[PDB]
Design a protein around this ligand. Sequence first.
Ligand code: HEM
Ligand code: HEM
Lengths: 149, 149
Amino acid sequence: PIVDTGSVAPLSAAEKTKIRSAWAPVYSTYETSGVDILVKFFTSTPAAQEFFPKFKGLTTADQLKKSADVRWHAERIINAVNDAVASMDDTEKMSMKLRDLSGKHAKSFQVDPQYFKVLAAVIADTVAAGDAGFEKLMSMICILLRSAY
Amino acid sequence: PIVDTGSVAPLSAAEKTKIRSAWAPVYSTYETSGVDILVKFFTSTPAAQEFFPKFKGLTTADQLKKSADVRWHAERIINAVNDAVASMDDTEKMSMKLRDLSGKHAKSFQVDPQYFKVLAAVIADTVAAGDAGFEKLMSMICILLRSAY
Ligand code: HEM
Ligand code: HEM
């Protein structure tokens, strides 16, 4: 399961390879994947909706997929994950970028840190449901995303 | 015409209104608009191509529209303009964000500052060809984008 506290063991060359494979297809059409992942997370997790101000009024999954605000937010989130995937070999660069992002979530967007893993899970199901390796990569991302809180 | 030096007169309430109108449709489907604007700029301005490292190998306009790298870069650029459009009433906020962006272009991406206006022109043709008001908004953006150089 995905964790957002403590530490997780490094990624093995084997795990990185599977991740890159499962990711390629999804990121290949990130504009669609991203929106589905975000629309899914948003609709099924009511408690977290108050944190998407620009989505006020939107409710049906159909309205969301059409809002340019939703698409932009999804494209940015989905590309952040991609940056992480592209940096599995430079864990130092991966950290700097995410810690920076952590700060923005805590100081500006003011989002409750508990949902990072909830959304991470949706991304995991969609990309490679069941793969522990990918779950490990999402854990690193969640742990770093909470580093500024 | 669009300028990237000196200063330009403030935007009148009348100009801001036309801008918001011409922009709404374009930004409404920014993922497509952005890619066309960028693909157009890139293909017709060979001299500036060396500054898009992630596009090495890409040549036909068809290849570009399919690359995820091109789409992401276009979506980011097109949204930067949108941020500016959304801030015409808070020229102070508009400056901070752009100056920051100026620094990135000069210190990291290392892009030749002369093309800002060339691309700004393509964005102007597409959005509201001929409108001086919109050209004024693009000038503010180019002047600020060169402030770090
Ligand atoms: C793996 C999880 C997540 C990733 C990788 C992620 C990534 C990002 C990225 C890259 C941005 C763009 C920031 C910028 O424009 O500078 C962003 C913005 C934002 N994120 Fe997160 N995010 C995550 C989870 C969440 C969650 C769970 C929430 C809400 C419960 C959230 C709420 C926001 C908000 C409110 C913004 C600001 C959007 C705006 O006003 O334009 N994020 N996030
Ligand atoms: C109105 C004009 C322009 C705007 C508003 C604009 C906006 C942006 C934005 C918002 C980014 C994202 C930066 C980030 O990821 O933090 C960016 C990246 C970039 N821009 Fe500009 N840009 C403009 C013109 C240009 C021009 C003319 C060139 C090249 C001749 C250029 C080359 C780059 C490069 C190389 C990147 C880095 C892309 C990457 O490696 O991910 N930009 N620009």
